[PDB]
Scaffold this active site. Structure first.
Site, short mmCIF file in Angstrom:
data_model
loop_
_atom_site.label_atom_id
_atom_site.label_comp_id
_atom_site.label_asym_id
_atom_site.label_seq_id
_atom_site.Cartn_x
_atom_site.Cartn_y
_atom_site.Cartn_z
N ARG A 1 34.65 16.12 24.24
CA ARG A 1 35.06 17.14 24.63
C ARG A 1 35.92 17.58 25.57
O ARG A 1 36.01 16.87 26.89
CB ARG A 1 33.66 18.56 24.49
N1 LIG Z 1 38.17 23.10 13.63
C1 LIG Z 1 37.11 22.25 14.36
N2 LIG Z 1 35.78 23.35 14.24
C2 LIG Z 1 34.73 21.89 14.70
N3 LIG Z 1 34.41 21.24 15.38
C3 LIG Z 1 35.91 21.24 15.57
C4 LIG Z 1 36.66 21.94 15.12
N4 LIG Z 1 38.64 20.80 16.27
C5 LIG Z 1 38.10 20.45 16.91
N5 LIG Z 1 36.03 19.64 16.90
C6 LIG Z 1 35.46 19.08 17.77
O1 LIG Z 1 34.49 18.69 16.69
C7 LIG Z 1 33.50 18.85 18.09
C8 LIG Z 1 32.16 19.44 17.42
O2 LIG Z 1 31.21 19.79 18.27
P1 LIG Z 1 30.26 20.77 18.81
O3 LIG Z 1 30.19 22.23 17.03
O4 LIG Z 1 30.13 21.35 19.67
O5 LIG Z 1 28.91 19.89 18.68
P2 LIG Z 1 27.83 19.96 17.21
O6 LIG Z 1 28.97 19.84 16.54
O7 LIG Z 1 26.33 19.07 17.42
O8 LIG Z 1 27.71 21.98 17.01
C9 LIG Z 1 33.76 20.17 18.85
O9 LIG Z 1 33.89 19.75 20.33
C10 LIG Z 1 35.46 20.07 18.98
O10 LIG Z 1 36.06 18.94 19.66
#
Ligand SMILES: Nc1ncnc2c1ncn2[C@@H]1O[C@H](COP(=O)(O)OP(=O)(O)O)[C@@H](O)[C@H]1O
Ligand SMILES: Nc1ncnc2c1ncn2[C@@H]1O[C@H](COP(=O)(O)OP(=O)(O)OP(=O)(O)O)[C@@H](O)[C@H]1O
Ligand SMILES: [Mg+2]
Ligand SMILES: [Mg+2]
Lengths: 53, 470, 484
Positions: free
Chosen positions: C348
């Site tokens: 992140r």
């Molecule tokens: N449009 C997007 N949707 C989802 N994730 C994204 C997107 N763009 C980048 N990412 C990356 O994918 C990661 C998804 O992690 P997160 O949703 O925070 O944890 P989890 O997937 O365990 O719920 C994000 O931290 C981000 O860095």
């Protein structure tokens, strides 16, 4: 045949993530990366044509 | 009230002996003498007038013989319109440092499930604005939505985007239950809603209540925060005849917390290692989160898939409890498509040509079929070569790749990550664009033009920019 | 002193009879001087885990309550000292002059006391500081197999912290804490030697729980170090902690619980291993201004057998951490050292926890490397120079740029310089095996001649157009003069 035997499915080659899956991934990209260039050039020619007319 | 004494403190499981009448199971016991409030919820009547209790906070400092009172009721939380804009703990204590939550009505976290004759049979459609969801797996108003996914796949980002798109627009109040999540994300959500206006610290127009038990909390606390949040939502459903939106993050933590305490409770481990009372407890929680005939509760629950194994008992059981399921695949996220919704795994009950309409159903099924055929073709590609397939095969592969790229949609909450401005696509535009791509009207456009765009109007416009920059 | 009698002493578990006023999780002192912790309070006995060898303890020994829940001597007097799990100095430099003791099991900061991650936690590694940036208050997992370089990454970050610590501003100063769990004493000594030859020990507290040290000590070590970091975090200072081999803490918990007769679960790890690791990592946070504005950064290390990140403890720790740095053996033996799998390594952004100057080149580097990874995974070349061969050459150039040696952390401006040189296409003509030589030579040339440029980059925090023009001149001139 007998259901117990392990059954393969579509996409297994790519799902494995092995050399053959990577080869398929790269090969698809190499083809369409070139195709996009041809398509983009054709679009540019179309735009130039409509600009002229 | 029948003041008990602690006889054993092993982990989070604390046993209390009541000389006077034993407290009934699920009642809340208060440990006297502690600087803060430690609530012990009765779990088992072990015998000899001793109750096995799971602590709702840390058990450090407890000394054998310490007096424990009986509240006489299951854990009761402040509930009402005054909880909006306030952060509360599992035991309903204000954790936002904004003073006591002055609600005139208190409700217990444990309650019976709505009856069969109270179940609603209507099925509407909720247009979130996400192309993948609205087309392939449309969400339903009042239905139970499930965001299945692994670690780092997009569950939290997707649920926050759903909050931004739906909850903000939705007039009815919402409740967020942060079950076993990162504390940092809780603070981020709290601050974001403050500036967004959903939570107003000055006025009393806040539209979202917050119940948080993070992973820093003990296993006992992480197993009841969901119950507290759903109790607040139930108040916003029964007492007030309003539509509510319950957003819970990582419900999986509800099941996992039970697995961390079942051994101490004295239960023989079930398969893989979960508690033997997995499905029963999960149902007891989930059946309460439903849209009765009195009111509607559109619930979006994030479900962590351990080790990306959907066959794991925790995600497997929760599948039956959810009307609409959206599974986030890591492989698609590795490809870059965000959101990483698996087009061939996500399902919705309202995906019925009678309900969503014939055109919508036909387009969705065509997209799914063409992606399946692409999956089939990839295996051939790996051996033969792309320059060996038939023209029909090449056409199918190209169209499928275009559709997969067009599934990706930039999110407003993901503007910080991607850098692209967030877009919201109407359902009609989604159907029209995917129908056009299936027909082949945009075969001349490059695949890149369809990636991280909104409507197909943005898709074609992007292609022109690339040609101008060619 | 309410005392008890040892009914049974076996394998470090003492079922003391008595101690009717003993607190749970409270330290108790044995007759021999060994200290233990009461964990299993039973109706007739107290299960105590001894913090040492149990041979001295025998049946009928008198166990005296210390009267306090287990705490560790905390403060800034521990900087430069190699301590054990209980804060006892093992460096032989004298008693630690700590005046404050903090409980090892304190709760983590709540929702309010925290603020968004802002400050960049530079590691000195090009790959980490460019493609997987780590901010202050962000828990990043250095996950990998055996002999993959996780400890190398951690120690390199530790050494990198020097350039800020020896400066003036206290905002950038980052005191470090290395918690060695299960590592042998020779390995810990080698780490300390590296730190004290790079003059990094002055700002590090090396908590050590080696294999010889008892399982309770190894279990307690991470919490001890975390509390020692919490000292700095809650006083407005910024701290970094590396829980080396958190997996070894899991096996210590497994031994302690099973010997305490607590029923086992998955892989015999006690069911609360998730909490064991969660309560530790959650403490790492970026405090808001009202709470001092301090921060505690955590870099846990997890060893994955055969690279199976789907194993129980790896998945547990992965869920907790904000991001994961994946180290793969195949990259290491393919030449990518450090072996960071930038494709799968995720972090992140830390709400813009990367300096603007780094961002400007890092975005394009990331996009180019992604495209290179997608296309150059065949090794079966047929014939597309403009499309593929152009892209894959740039990818190879950027990979060689990312390759970095050991115990040589680079300042962020120097990383910006080299990444600039590679990402602007200036090195595309350079030979793929000569890229590393160019990297070293260009680094030296910039540092010596154009040190003002580096100073400007560092001071501004952003590469402006004028600074970009200066960099253009520098790189072009040196590139032309690179090969005599
Ligand atoms: N449009 C997007 N949707 C989802 N994730 C994204 C997107 N763009 C980048 N990412 C990356 O994918 C990661 C998804 O992690 P997160 O949703 O925070 O944890 P989890 O997937 O365990 O719920 C994000 O931290 C981000 O860095
Ligand atoms: N940047 C680097 N370039 C090349 N070799 C390196 C680099 N960093 C470390 N190494 C080497 O890699 C090997 C393993 O490194 P390291 O000791 O950090 O591994 P590890 O995974 O922490 O080990 P262990 O399993 O013993 O804990 C050592 O021989 C070390 O010198
Ligand atoms: Mg998340
Ligand atoms: Mg190591």
């Amino acid at each position: 045949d007998t259901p117990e035997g392990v059954r393969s499915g579509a996409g297994a080659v790519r799902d494995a993530g092995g050399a053959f899956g990577k080869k398929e991934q790269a090969d698809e990209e190499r083809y369409f990366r070139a195709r996009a260039r041809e398509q983009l050039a054709a679009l540019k020619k179309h735009h130039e044509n409509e600009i002229s007319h | 009230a029948a003041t008990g004494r602690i006889v054993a403190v092993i982990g989070a499981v604390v046993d209390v002996q009541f000389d006077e009448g034993l407290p009934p199971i699920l009642n809340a016991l208060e440990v006297q003498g502690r600087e803060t409030r430690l609530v012990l919820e009765v779990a088992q009547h072990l015998g000899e007038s001793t109750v096995r209790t799971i602590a709702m906070d840390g058990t450090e400092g407890l000394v054998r013989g310490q007096k424990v009172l009986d509240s006489g009721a299951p854990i009761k939380i402040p509930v009402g319109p005054e909880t909006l804009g306030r952060i509360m703990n599992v035991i309903g204590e204000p954790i936002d440092e904004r003073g006591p939550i002055k609600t005139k009505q208190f409700a217990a976290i444990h309650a019976e499930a709505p009856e069969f004759m109270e179940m609603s049979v209507e099925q509407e459609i909720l247009v979130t604005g996400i192309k993948v969801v609205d087309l392939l797996a449309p969400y339903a108003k009042g239905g139970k939505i499930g965001l299945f996914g692994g670690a780092g796949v997009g569950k939290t980002v997707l649920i926050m985007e759903l909050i931004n798109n739906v909850a903000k627009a939705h007039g009815g109040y919402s409740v967020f239950a942060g079950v076993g999540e990162r504390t940092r994300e809780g603070n981020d959500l709290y601050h974001e809603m403050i500036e967004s206006g959903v939570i107003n610290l000055k006025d009393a127009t806040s539209k979202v209540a917050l119940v948080y038990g993070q992973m820093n909390e003990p296993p006992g606390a992480r197993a009841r925060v969901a119950l507290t949040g759903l109790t607040v939502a139930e108040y916003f459903r029964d007492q007030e005849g309003q539509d509510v939106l319950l957003f819970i993050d990582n419900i999986f933590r509800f099941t996992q917390a039970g697995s961390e305490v079942s051994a101490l409770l004295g239960r023989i481990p079930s398969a893989v290692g979960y508690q033997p009372t997995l499905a029963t407890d999960m149902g007891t929680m989930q059946e309460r989160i439903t849209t009765t005939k009195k009111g509607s509760i559109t619930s979006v629950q994030a479900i962590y898939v351990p080790a990306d194994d959907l066959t794991d008992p925790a995600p497997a059981t929760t599948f039956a409890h959810l009307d609409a399921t959206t599974v986030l695949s890591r492989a698609i996220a590795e490809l870059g498509i965000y959101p990483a919704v698996d087009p061939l795994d996500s399902t919705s009950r309202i995906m019925d040509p009678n309900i969503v309409g014939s055109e919508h159903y036909d387009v969705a099924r065509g997209v799914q079929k063409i992606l399946q055929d692409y999956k089939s073709l990839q295996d051939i590609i790996a051996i033969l070569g792309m320059d060996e397939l038939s023209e029909e095969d090449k056409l199918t592969v190209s169209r499928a790749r275009k559709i997969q790229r067009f599934l990706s949609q930039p999110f407003q909450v993901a503007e910080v990550f991607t850098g692209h401005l967030g877009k919201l696509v109407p359902l009609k535009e989604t159907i029209k664009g995917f129908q056009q791509i299936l027909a082949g009207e945009y075969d001349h456009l490059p695949e890149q033009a369809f990636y991280m765009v909104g409507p197909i109007e943005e898709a074609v416009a992007k292609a022109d920019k690339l040609a101008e920059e060619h | 002193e309410e005392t008890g009698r040892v009914l049974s002493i076996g394998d470090g578990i003492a079922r003391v009879h008595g101690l009717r006023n003993v607190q749970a999780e409270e330290m108790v002192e044995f007759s021999s001087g060994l200290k233990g912790m009461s964990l299993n309070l039973e109706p007739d006995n107290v299960g105590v885990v001894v913090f040492g060898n149990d041979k001295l303890i025998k049946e009928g020994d008198i166990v005296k309550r210390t009267g306090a829940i287990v705490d560790v001597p905390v403060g800034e007097e521990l900087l430069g000292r190699v301590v054990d799990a209980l804060g006892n100095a093992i460096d032989g430099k004298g008693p630690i002059g700590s005046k404050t003791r903090r409980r090892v099991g304190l709760k983590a900061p709540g929702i309010i006391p925290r603020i968004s991650v802002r400050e960049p936690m530079q590691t000195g590694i090009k790959a980490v500081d460019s493609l997987v940036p780590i901010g202050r208050g962000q828990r990043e997992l250095i996950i990998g197999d055996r002999q993959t370089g996780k400890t190398s990454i951690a120690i390199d970050t530790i050494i990198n912290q020097k350039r800020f610590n020896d400066g003036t501003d206290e905002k950038k100063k980052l005191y470090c804490i290395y918690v060695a769990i299960g590592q042998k004493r020779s390995t810990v000594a080698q780490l300390v030697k590296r730190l004290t030859d790079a003059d990094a020990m002055k700002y590090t507290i090396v908590v050590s729980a080696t294999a010889s040290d008892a399982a309770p000590l190894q279990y307690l070590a991470p919490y001890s170090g975390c509390s020692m970091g919490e000292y700095f975090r809650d006083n407005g200072k910024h701290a970094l902690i590396i829980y080396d081999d958190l997996s070894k803490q899991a096996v210590a918990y497994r031994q302690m619980s099973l010997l305490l007769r607590r029923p086992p679960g998955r892989e015999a790890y006690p069911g609360d291993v998730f909490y064991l690791h969660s309560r530790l990592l959650e403490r790492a946070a970026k405090m808001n201004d009202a709470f001092g504005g301090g921060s505690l950064t955590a870099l846990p290390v997890i060893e994955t057998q055969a690279g199976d990140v789907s194993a129980y403890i790896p998945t547990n720790v992965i869920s907790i951490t904000d991001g994961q740095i994946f180290l793969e053996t195949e990259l290491f033996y393919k030449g990518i050292r450090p072996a960071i799998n930038v494709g799968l390594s995720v972090s992140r952004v830390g709400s813009a926890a990367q300096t603007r100057a780094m961002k400007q080149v890092a975005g394009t580097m990331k996009l180019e490397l992604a495209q290179y990874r997608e296309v150059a995974a065949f090794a079966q070349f047929g014939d597309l120079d403009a499309a593929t061969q152009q892209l894959l050459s740039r990818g190879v150039r950027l990979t060689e740029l990312l390759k970095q040696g050991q115990y040589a952390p680079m300042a962020i401006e120097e990383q910006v310089a080299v990444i600039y040189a590679g990402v602007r296409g200036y090195l595309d003509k350079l030979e793929p095996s000569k890229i590393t030589k160019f990297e070293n030579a260009f680094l030296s040339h910039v540092i010596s001649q154009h040190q003002a440029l580096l100073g400007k980059i560092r001071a501004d925090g952003k590469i402006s157009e004028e600074t970009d023009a200066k960099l253009k001149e520098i790189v072009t001139n040196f590139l032309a003069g690179f090969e005599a």
